[PDB]
């Protein structure tokens, strides 16, 4: 089975819990395929994957706005192959702000008005991640036998 995991990080916080979330899955079996959105193209991007992750921190604070790195693969999220795609988002985020992780509602509703799959719901981490990596392990173990 092979697995997508692209993740928009700033300070390195949904960095850390793509990487957690990916050696959950690598140990389980899966290849993993773990690429920053910066470093990506939204075209076919989903083709050949069995399960897609996508990891994001959310901004703007008096507003929603997500991850700049991410933004460009979210505004062509209908050219990625989400159709039918089984997946399920992360980020990172702060309770202190007034919209906590917008940017995994964001994504999810709209992988979901693409016709994906979102075998489970989106994983929120307040604070440092490392504070949450059993929280993280347990999420990627729970998605995973949940496709
Ligand atoms: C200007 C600013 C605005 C923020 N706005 C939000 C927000 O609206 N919601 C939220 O949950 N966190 C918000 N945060 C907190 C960040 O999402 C948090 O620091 C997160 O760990 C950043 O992840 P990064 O390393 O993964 O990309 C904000 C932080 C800053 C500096």
């Known amino acids: 089975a092979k697995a997508l995991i692209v993740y928009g990080s700033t300070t390195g916080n949904t960095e850390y819990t793509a990487e957690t979330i990916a050696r959950e ?6 290849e993993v395929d773990s690429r920053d959105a910066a470093s990506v193209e939204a075209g076919g991007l989903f083709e050949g994957f069995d399960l897609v992750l996508l990891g994001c921190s959310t901004w703007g604070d008096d507003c929603i706005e997500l991850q700049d790195d991410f933004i460009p693969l979210f505004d062509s999220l209908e050219e990625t192959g989400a159709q039918g795609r ?11 702000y007034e919209y906590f992780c917008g940017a995994v509602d964001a994504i999810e509703e709209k992988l979901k008005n693409l016709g994906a799959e979102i075998v489970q719901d989106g994983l929120r981490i307040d604070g440092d991640p490392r504070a949450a990596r059993d929280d993280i392990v347990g999420w990627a173990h729970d998605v995973r036998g949940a496709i």
């Open 86 to 96: 089984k997946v399920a988002c992360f980020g990172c985020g702060d309770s202190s």
């Open 25 to 30: 899955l690598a140990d389980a079996g899966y």
